[PDB]
Amino acid sequence: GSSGSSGPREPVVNDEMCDVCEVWTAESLFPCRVCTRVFHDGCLRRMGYIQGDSAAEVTEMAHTETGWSCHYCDNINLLLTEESGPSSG
């Protein structure tokens, strides 16, 4: 194979490291910032998590404070009809 890596000084460890890249960036990380679990939208579609035809007229609107909310959070922040269907009870 091949080997070659040194440096007894390891970089800071942040819990906000992509689960597919394990890397962060100054700017806001996707999907969200607060949501501990961070994963690049592309890392999902690529690997094989989404691969769904979700043609939309939007590129990336997560960074913003009030934009897209990942599944984990699934917050009803966005102002729009979110008719839900909970188990009849």
Q: Where are the beta strands (DSSP E) in 1-89?
A: none
Binding segment (CB under 5 A) for Zn ion, from list 4-12, 47-55, 66-74, 78-86: 66-74
Q: How far is the CB of 84 from Zn ion (least distance, A)?
A: 18
Using CB under 5 A, which residues numbered 39 to 58 contact Zn ion? 40, 43
- With binding defined as CB under 5 A, does residue 35 bind Zn ion? yes
- The angle at the Cα of 25, spanning 23 to 29, to the nearest 5 degrees, equals 85
Q: CB–CB of 66/33 below 8 Å?
A: no
Residues in the site for Zn ion, rule: CB under 5 A? 18, 20-21, 32, 35, 40, 43, 69-70, 73
